[PDB]
Paper text:
Herein, we report a crystal structure of full-length [name] luminal domain from [name] ([name]). The structural model starts at Phe21 and ends at Ala465 and the overall structure is separated into three distinct domains: the PA domain (Phe21-Trp175), the thioredoxin (TRX) domain (Val186-Phe396), and the EGF-like domain (Glu409-Ala462). The resolved structure had disordered regions at the C-terminus, where density could not be uniquely traced for proper model building after the first EGF-like domain. At the beginning of the refinement, a clear electron density attached to the sidechain of Asn289 in the central domain was observed and assigned as two N-acetylglucosamine (GlcNAc). The PA and the TRX domains are connected by a 7-residue linker with no significant interaction between them. Although there is no direct interaction between the intramolecular PA and TRX domains, the two domains display extensive interactions with those domains of two neighboring molecules related by a crystallographic threefold symmetry, forming a cyclical domain-swapping. PDBePISA analysis of the crystallographic intermolecular interaction between the PA and the TRX domains reveals that the interface score is 1.0, indicating that [name] is highly likely to form a trimer in solution. The interaction between the TRX and EGF-like domains is held by multiple H-bond interactions. The two additional EGF-like domains that are tandemly located at the C-terminus are not visible in the crystal structure, indicating their high flexibility. However, our crystal structure shows that the [name] has an extended conformation with significant dynamic flexibility of the EGF-like domains.
Residue numbers in the entry:
A (entry chain A), B (entry chain A), C (entry chain A): 21 to 119, 138 to 465
Amino acid sequence: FVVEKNNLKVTSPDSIKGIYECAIGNFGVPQYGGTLVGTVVYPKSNQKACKSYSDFDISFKSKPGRLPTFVLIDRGDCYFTLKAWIAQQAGAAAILVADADYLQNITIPSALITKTLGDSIKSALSGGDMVNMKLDWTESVPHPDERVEYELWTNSNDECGKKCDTQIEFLKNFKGAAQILEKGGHTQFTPHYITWYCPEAFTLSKQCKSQCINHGRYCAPDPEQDFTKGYDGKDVVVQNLRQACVYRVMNDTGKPWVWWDYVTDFAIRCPMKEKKYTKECADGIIKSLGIDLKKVDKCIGDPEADVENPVLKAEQESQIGKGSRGDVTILPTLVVNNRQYRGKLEKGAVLKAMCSGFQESTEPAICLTEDLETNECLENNGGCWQDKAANITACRDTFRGRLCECPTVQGVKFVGDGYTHCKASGA
Amino acid sequence: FVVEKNNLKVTSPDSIKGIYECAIGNFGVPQYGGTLVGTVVYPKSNQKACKSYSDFDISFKSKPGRLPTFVLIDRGDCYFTLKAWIAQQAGAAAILVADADYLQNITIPSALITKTLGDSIKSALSGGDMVNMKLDWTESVPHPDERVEYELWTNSNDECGKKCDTQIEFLKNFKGAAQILEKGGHTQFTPHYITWYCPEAFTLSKQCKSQCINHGRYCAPDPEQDFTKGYDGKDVVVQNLRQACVYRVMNDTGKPWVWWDYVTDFAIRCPMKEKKYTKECADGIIKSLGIDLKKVDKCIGDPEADVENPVLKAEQESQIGKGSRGDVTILPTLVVNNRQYRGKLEKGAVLKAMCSGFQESTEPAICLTEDLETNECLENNGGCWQDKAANITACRDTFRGRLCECPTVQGVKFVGDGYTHCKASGA
Amino acid sequence: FVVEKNNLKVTSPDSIKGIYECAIGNFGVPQYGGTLVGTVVYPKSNQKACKSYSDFDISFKSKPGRLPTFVLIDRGDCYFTLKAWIAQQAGAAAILVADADYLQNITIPSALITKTLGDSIKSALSGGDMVNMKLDWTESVPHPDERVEYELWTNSNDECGKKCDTQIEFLKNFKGAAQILEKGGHTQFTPHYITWYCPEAFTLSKQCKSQCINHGRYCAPDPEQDFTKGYDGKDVVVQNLRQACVYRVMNDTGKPWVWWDYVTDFAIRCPMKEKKYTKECADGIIKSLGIDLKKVDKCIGDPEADVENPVLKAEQESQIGKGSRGDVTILPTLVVNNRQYRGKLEKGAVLKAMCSGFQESTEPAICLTEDLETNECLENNGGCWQDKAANITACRDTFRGRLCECPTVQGVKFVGDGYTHCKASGA
Ligand SMILES: *[C@@H]1O[C@H](CO)[C@@H](O[C@@H]2O[C@H](CO)[C@@H](O)[C@H](O)[C@H]2NC(C)=O)[C@H](O)[C@H]1NC(C)=O
Ligand SMILES: *[C@@H]1O[C@H](CO)[C@@H](O[C@@H]2O[C@H](CO)[C@@H](O)[C@H](O)[C@H]2NC(C)=O)[C@H](O)[C@H]1NC(C)=O
Ligand SMILES: *[C@@H]1O[C@H](CO)[C@@H](O[C@@H]2O[C@H](CO)[C@@H](O)[C@H](O)[C@H]2NC(C)=O)[C@H](O)[C@H]1NC(C)=O
């Protein structure tokens, strides 16, 4: 029963022409936003609408060019759903109510009104004035209890081998659908990372010291971080922790989907081979996306202090499956509705697995079409380089998410990184 | 039983080599266009093909490199379908017939021939001449009784608010599929518009005069046409009426799908804010698309005369649902197969709703793929600006319909409207 | 039971830290490539894992931050599948085994090890050392018995009429999916061509001499090769034979999918109207694709000698259907799993017909998405013109296969054929 004011306006009986608030039951109103104009009829008998309108020889069927009929029902003796159904049978187009099987078959809008408003219409009608109406509504937003819960156990490191390229490859291919699903209000996505604690046997180890932040509490998941690259296993732990804090901070602000733009831009902009697996590189992206560094940095804490890290401790506890899902033990792991996905990690494969969690004709568009696009360049140029003076930008929005790439203007492919400096090349 | 001449040609017994007309039963011929060459065998017994060929020790199975066998059956005593099945069992590749369950399992082409032709083959054969054949056919066109009926109740006005943008947004996204579906012969689409008549109480009203054409018979559906824009509710009624007449005129000429190119080009080219919601603007598009203005203008009539408007009167009568569909009372309303669609107004959502009205493997391509394109630029450059002297055009064909947009040539994005003037810009 | 060495490495008990070979049963390992780290526990009792671990009060459930448990099972008394299931129930994450209904419900990796290795772990453990592990695996390759068999009976000629354009049109639209399906290891595609032998009656005929290679054994399928174009029916027979030999030669080298790049490039580069239906034109493409001309030419043989042509003779024998499929008598004919396809010859239509031959969640990506691309430009520039000195190429990879088209560089559309010469145009 969603309440809006602009929904119910009163086309003139000019003495009471106005915009009133109502309460519309979710039944009888279609998925798409629409508008319904009509006029009000208040029956002299069967005013509860609990007995069948046919029994009284009352009918509401319209002639052509005639306004559809809004029946004024008084509440009592039976539910609104029955009032709406009874009215619908008699030929009503809507129902204005003043102050468990057939439910699917109710298709006329139902609105509750004030007694003070209902009385106005009744007297306006009794004087002889046509009381016309107008009833808008927006397209259906999914109920939050109906949204699919998926979760991803990933690793941010890139200097792995095949196993890390495939992961970052998935994040890039799914980013578009991931964002559309969640911005549309169909999915609760939570990313997770995996860390182990140092056994007492190897506390103050040479190994545990290059692997573990916070005095051994959280250590790098794979015991081969090829320190030859110059980056210890503990550097990975910190970077992952930053990603999780990027998520928490963005989730608290109502925009979790920005994680996808962080971890992909991190992959692009902060490579290990070029010695950019750094705080300063990550913090660059935090400016670009416009995330709160003070909050992210505070979430990360002091990875050198003999203290716990609530986020990293919660992740170690999330890895133990509760209820029916098992413990997460494989990197990566996709979980959809507290059940571990064991299929191919392809967008096509993963999307089918989730769209089965939707009810038919509650299916998001992203399930039925690839003709879609993220809407991220409308905010802050998506964090990519632009040039307001020349109307050019490096921001492009794609079925696979938002991209910062140096634009080709007047045939000239600009050269640069697209997040900070694009410029014209040569001939 | 489709009749074609070029379908049946007679590879030479040179005395009767020629191109004859036939009559092919729809059974035994596949969906795709193909060609079948063989040679004719006329059995001495079981010539009705009503008893089983096996009973007579007659068989038609071929050796390799050998031409497939065309059995010459005489009509009588049983249906063609049985003749074709009997022959098929014995090993026939086709059947030439001279002058309710197994039917699915018939897969060899069946053709009826003249007695004068059948006798020619029989004598040619009796002299000893191989009578070879060739049998072409085109891909299957859907039977018109099998096509899906959808209908859309829309509004052409644009200065509404959110509700009008979403509608015009749908027309633009669906235009490609809308056109492909109908040009392919799978859908009968009819657009509709909604108008109310002025009550006797408010005849000669100040309001009814700015809302209603034809002396009150047809009035603007929403009673807020924000006359501040300078355009009365009656201006909308006329524009909608023009759109419906664009449809009727184009439907009468066998090209209804041009409505989609009209209403989208109207949206683009005739905006209300720029004071282009005008006859002269609309008539511009009628030239571009090459529609008959004399017929469209005659359909619109004299919206100032005390007379009815058959199209607008038929629309007011179409709004009252007949049979099982209800009265259309919401703008917009999509109806598919005389049942009101109540889902999201997305292409993906709407296309699933219609492709369920097709039989499996009668499914149009547009149901199974997004790798498609309208074919509108082959006619008159789709009504967009071109430049024959430079091979450039503003016409582009898209999965979302035909677009007139100023081309980027040698890297130079041309500037203009793409329907009437494109030109080179600056540096 | 796939055997790899790099799959099983032993995170340190430093005295036995190393990379050992194993044998992983296909059960309990997901579709996606992943990695699993844990530590080994060797139970003192129930070491066959044949009785239920619960009966002994043995459990493997982990605390958080704790490494997942690898149970060391001794083989005997029951199958690995039961050992893995029993262990899984008790809370194991994997199983190390030393030296017909519930099977679906087994989800922990199972690996077999050497007795010499199993003993090492046992003694290492008995001294007190944590024996940790690491277990990688790649994404699942489909078993070759599970792949779909489709076959196409086509014609290479182009100067037909509508029937030949539609065929070449299909080859071009399907080439992308055709290649992806087969390179991914989901389909065995074999192309076929159709030829008839000259009847003794018309041996040494005027007609049979312009139609048939190898002294009449193999003749052009349609008896109208419009010799007005200058190309006899026997020229078509030879060109088709070359295509089939291109397939055989490429199939023998493990790259059959190159046929698709041959027959489409033949269509583009060797047209009949421009008198390019020549050996020298075809041999040009054989260089481009880098096919072995010596093998292809030897497969074609001497189409003028009184001899058989094994490939053309095998094709005439393949046309006679064996088992349940009929004789192929229509051009074109698509067969999927020894059953003749009778639907529309559209990619969308054809792909549904094949993806039904896959088990759910064994579905290739190409079945669930159009966001795909051939990977052909990584090899030899796909056979298209390039210019290494300028980083430009004519090779582009598409959902519809690999394309050689002259690139547009700095806004300048280059002009040429894209296989051999691209060059800058004018202004
Ligand atoms: C991310 O934000 C959401 C909502 O802001 C959080 O979800 C809530 O979690 C609490 C604690 O379990 C529940 O009682 C609420 O019902 C949840 N609200 C929802 C699901 O809308 C979520 O915990 C946040 N943090 C994450 C996901 O790590
Ligand atoms: C648009 O054109 C079609 C065909 O030209 C019209 O459809 C015919 O309508 C008459 C009257 O109801 C029927 O008897 C015919 O069977 C219809 N032919 C068909 C469906 O092929 C249609 O009425 C025209 N006008 C519209 C749709 O407004
Ligand atoms: C193309 O190559 C494949 C494999 O190299 C050939 O398939 C083999 O054919 C033999 C003979 O029938 C079988 O015994 C094998 O089991 C097949 N191997 C497979 C299917 O992997 C095939 O014959 C070759 N030639 C074609 C398809 O014309």
